[PDB]
Amino acid sequence: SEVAHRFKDLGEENFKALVLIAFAQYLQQCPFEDHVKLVNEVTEFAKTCVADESAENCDKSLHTLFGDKLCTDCCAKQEPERNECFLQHKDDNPNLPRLVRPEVDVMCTAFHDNEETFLKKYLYEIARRHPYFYAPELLFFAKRYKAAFTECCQAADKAACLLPKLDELRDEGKASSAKQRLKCASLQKFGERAFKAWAVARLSQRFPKAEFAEVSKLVTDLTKVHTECCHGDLLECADDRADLAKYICENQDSISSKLKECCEKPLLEKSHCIAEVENDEMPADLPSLAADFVESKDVCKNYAEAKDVFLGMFLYEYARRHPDYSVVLLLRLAKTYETTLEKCCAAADPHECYAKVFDEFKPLVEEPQNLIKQNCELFEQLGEYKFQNALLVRYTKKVPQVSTPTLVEVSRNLGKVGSKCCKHPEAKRMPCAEDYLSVVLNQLCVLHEKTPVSDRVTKCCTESLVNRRPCFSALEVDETYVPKEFNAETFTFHADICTLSEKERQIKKQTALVELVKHKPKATKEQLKAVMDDFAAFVEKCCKADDKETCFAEEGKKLV
Numbered sequence: 017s018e019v020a021h022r023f024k025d026l027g028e029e030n031f032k033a034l035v036l037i038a039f040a041q042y043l044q045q046c047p048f049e050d051h052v053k054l055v056n057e058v059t060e061f062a063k064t065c066v067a068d069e070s071a072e073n074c075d076k077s078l079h080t081l082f083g084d085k086l087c088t089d090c091c092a093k094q095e096p097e098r099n100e101c102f103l104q105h106k107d108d109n110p111n112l113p114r115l116v117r118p119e120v121d122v123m124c125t126a127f128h129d130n131e132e133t134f135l136k137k138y139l140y141e142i143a144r145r146h147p148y149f150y151a152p153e154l155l156f157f158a159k160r161y162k163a164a165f166t167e168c169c170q171a172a173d174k175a176a177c178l179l180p181k182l183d184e185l186r187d188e189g190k191a192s193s194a195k196q197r198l199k200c201a202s203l204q205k206f207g208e209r210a211f212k213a214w215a216v217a218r219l220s221q222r223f224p225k226a227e228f229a230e231v232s233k234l235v236t237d238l239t240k241v242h243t244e245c246c247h248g249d250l251l252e253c254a255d256d257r258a259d260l261a262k263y264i265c266e267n268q269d270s271i272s273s274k275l276k277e278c279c280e281k282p283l284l285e286k287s288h289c290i291a292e293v294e295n296d297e298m299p300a301d302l303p304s305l306a307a308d309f310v311e312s313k314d315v316c317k318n319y320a321e322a323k324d325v326f327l328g329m330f331l332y333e334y335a336r337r338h339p340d341y342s343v344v345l346l347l348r349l350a351k352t353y354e355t356t357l358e359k360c361c362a363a364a365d366p367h368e369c370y371a372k373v374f375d376e377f378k379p380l381v382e383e384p385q386n387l388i389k390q391n392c393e394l395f396e397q398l399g400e401y402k403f404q405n406a407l408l409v410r411y412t413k414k415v416p417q418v419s420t421p422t423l424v425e426v427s428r429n430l431g432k433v434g435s436k437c438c439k440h441p442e443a444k445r446m447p448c449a450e451d452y453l454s455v456v457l458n459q460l461c462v463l464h465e466k467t468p469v470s471d472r473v474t475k476c477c478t479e480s481l482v483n484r485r486p487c488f489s490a491l492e493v494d495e496t497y498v499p500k501e502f503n504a505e506t507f508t509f510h511a512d513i514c515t516l517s518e519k520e521r522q523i524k525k526q527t528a529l530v531e532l533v534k535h536k537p538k539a540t541k542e543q544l545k546a547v548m549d550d551f552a553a554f555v556e557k558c559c560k561a562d563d564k565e566t567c568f569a570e571e572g573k574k575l576v
């Protein structure tokens with residue numbers, strides 16, 4: 017019996033949780049206490065099965081069991097095609113109430129009142145709004161969300177304690193979800209082989225002192241974890257994730273010397289810890305690569321005789337000595353090498369055709385290097401908010417078809433890179449910057465995917481996950497684009513704008529900026545600053561009273 021096996025390793029409180037999440041992800045439109053009920057039957061059923069293995073129906077796969085409960089289009093359909101239906105029905109941008117957080121006291125009132133139903137409503141709300149969210153990490157966000165309600169409601173002021181701590185959570189939230197979203201699309205749209213290469217590369221940076229047979233082992237385990245998570249098999253996902261942790265913590269003199277403190281922590285924490293560890297110090301006296309990947313006579317023998325292992329060794333030896341290269345770059349480097357080997361071994365003097373191989377990395381390394389210096393400067397010379405507006409006009413010009421909210425959301429998150437990365441010392445700038453940019457570009461990739469409107473985006477999104485960034489960078493303004501038709505149903509206003517949070521306040525402006533730029537695809541910096549400055553002036557007026565509602569209306573209409 018599978019269920020039971022999972023109920024035992026995971027324990028109940030986790031089990032109950034992981035099943036809840038899976039139901040929220042499977043059915044994002046369905047009511048809360050409909051799902052809690054479904055979770056309850058299953059848990060109680062899994063107890064009968066935990067008792068007697070033979071108990072009727074306990075031999076059934078998790079898919080059959082979860083699918084049946086769910087069904088109490090996709091249901092008039094049987095396993096395995098049925099499960100594929102739920103998975104294929106997942107929605108990255110679901111029509112659901114923004115999640116406004118009401119008066120704190122009331123949150124402490126519901127928390128101390130009913131504390132199981134209050135953590136279960138948090139899982140349920142994150143999960144249906146983030147249908148690909150790394151299941152085990154959620155549990156960890158839930159532990160912390162409690163620790164915060166527990167340790168603020170019993171304090172002087174509960175607004176000053178809680179809110180910051182809870183804001184720090186929502187942030188880590190977003191970022192973790194976007195990171196997991198990108199692993200799932202690597203597997204789903206591009207297949208295991210690409211993910212494994214990504215893994216080989218990243219782990220090898222983290223664990224440079226570790227050997228290739230050790231990195232491979234961790235790579236199969238890691239990909240197995242994610243395969244299941246991204247496929248919605250959360251229970252096995254959590255189980256196998258815990259096991260990787262038990263494993264890393266036992267062999268940590270074979271893997272890295274940075275695990276001490278992570279591996280003394282409780283299960284939920286250690287995994288989260290391990291996944292964030294600092295790169296270990298790269299080994300002492302390391303032979304340049306050329307040795308066996310260029311100088312050798314068996315070069316072409318080995319690539320023919322064992323390509324995957326061989327190209328595995330390369331990426332690994334190259335990665336372990338470039339913690340200052342982004343994973344994307346190294347993956348490009350790796351592809352450029354296999355491709356070269358491809359032509360050279362086919363020709364009359366292979367050793368000669370391929371000895372210039374390392375000399376085709378030059379331009380590939382250069383491109384990201386400059387781009388990261390240029391805008392890391394523009395941003396010290398501009399600041400985040402002003403940096404975001406610049407990205408916002410650039411990317412709108414590139415792909416003006418994409419929806420405003422997507423444009424605003426992506427571009428702002430693109431701005432968060434200067435802030436996040438440009439502080440770092442140059443040998444950390446690049447993996448930060450570029451590895452961060454892939455996550456936010458994938459967001460755009462998956463947000464646009466629900467309803468494609470721009471073939472320039474569709475193309476860069478399907479061509480190669482690795483090339484995705486350069487593909488976006490190299491785009492220039494869209495001169496085919498039919499300039500947009502000015503609409504009064506826009507710069508219509510809303511005396512609310514006077515009382516918006518600083519965030520919401522910047523978000524309305526940026527949203528107006530997009531519109532603007534979409535109205536004149538070709539327009540100066542100097543004419544946008546002009547038209548924007550007008551709008552700002554108009555708003556500062558009407559936010560000073562008598563009749564704000566009519567002020568906004570007259571000037572709305574007196575711009576009509």
Ligand SMILES: O=C(CO)[C@@H](O)[C@H](O)[C@H](O)CO
Nearest residue numbers: 195199218291292293294451
């Ligand atoms: O690069 C790092 C190290 O901070 C992490 O972002 C890592 O890539 C992630 O934990 C695995 O998905």
Ligand SMILES: OC[C@H]1O[C@](O)(CO)[C@@H](O)[C@@H]1O
Nearest residue numbers: 238241257260264287290291
């Ligand atoms: O994302 C990769 C990292 O996450 C873990 O698999 C645990 O989830 C660690 O083994 C690995 O270092």
